[PDB]
Amino acid sequence: VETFAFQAEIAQLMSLIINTFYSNKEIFLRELISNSSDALDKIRYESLTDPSKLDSGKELHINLIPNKQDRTLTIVDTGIGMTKADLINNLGTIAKSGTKAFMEALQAGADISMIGQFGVGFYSAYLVAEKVTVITKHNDDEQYAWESSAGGSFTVRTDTGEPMGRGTKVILHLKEDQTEYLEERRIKEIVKKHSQFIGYPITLFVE
Numbered sequence: 001v002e003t004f005a006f007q008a009e010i011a012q013l014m015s016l017i018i019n020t021f022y023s024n025k026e027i028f029l030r031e032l033i034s035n036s037s038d039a040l041d042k043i044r045y046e047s048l049t050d051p052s053k054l055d056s057g058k059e060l061h062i063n064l065i066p067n068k069q070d071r072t073l074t075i076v077d078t079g080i081g082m083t084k085a086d087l088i089n090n091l092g093t094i095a096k097s098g099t100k101a102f103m104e105a106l107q108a109g110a111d112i113s114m115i116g117q118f119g120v121g122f123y124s125a126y127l128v129a130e131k132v133t134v135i136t137k138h139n140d141d142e143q144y145a146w147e148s149s150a151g152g153s154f155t156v157r158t159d160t161g162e163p164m165g166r167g168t169k170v171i172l173h174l175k176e177d178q179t180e181y182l183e184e185r186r187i188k189e190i191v192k193k194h195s196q197f198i199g200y201p202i203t204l205f206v207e
């Protein structure tokens, strides 16, 4: 298990998201689904020049899995996945410019709902989750588990859980007062409102 500090600006954006009063929390789902969609476009595109890239799974989809007992909402995709270099350094470097532009936009009167336009949409997960666990598998690498409860740090470890072939799985450990995102009618209403035109099947699992 390796522990890493977030870049100062990312830690700052996460504290802003956790501490600001903002009732329109549902926007987190559209952001996560959008990231899943981008990952699926990436593997779909790469497979046109190299079909062997689909040997770790042909089906390109998104699964929404609520679990009332564990108090979790899982977003699973069969996209390109991420390498250790994406998790640790690469994505953090890009997030720096996006974070800065977003905070600047917020000071100038922009809304938290515009987070996605700055490429930092993922951090809206902290409107509803006390902890986020990300399981990922890229064709060129091993299966990894990324994790953060904010507080300025994240961990990366090799995942010795059930293999997932290829893709990314986002496990949202919800805050006690955010259990409405475990309700079928609530998730359906959110998907229909903000994610109706995603070019991949979205299956909302029932309990």
Ligand SMILES: CN(Cc1ccc(Cl)cc1)C(=O)c1cc2c(Cc3ccccc3)n[nH]c2cc1O
Binding pocket: 032, 035, 036, 037, 038, 039, 040, 042, 077, 079, 080, 081, 082, 086, 087, 091, 119, 122, 134, 136, 146, 167, 168, 170
């Ligand atoms: C290749 N991609 C697409 C991708 C990558 C980076 C970004 Cl910033 C956006 C999209 C994925 O595997 C991927 C990532 C994410 C994230 C962001 C993230 C969380 C923790 C650690 C790292 C990144 N949320 N939901 C996702 C779903 C995905 O399929």
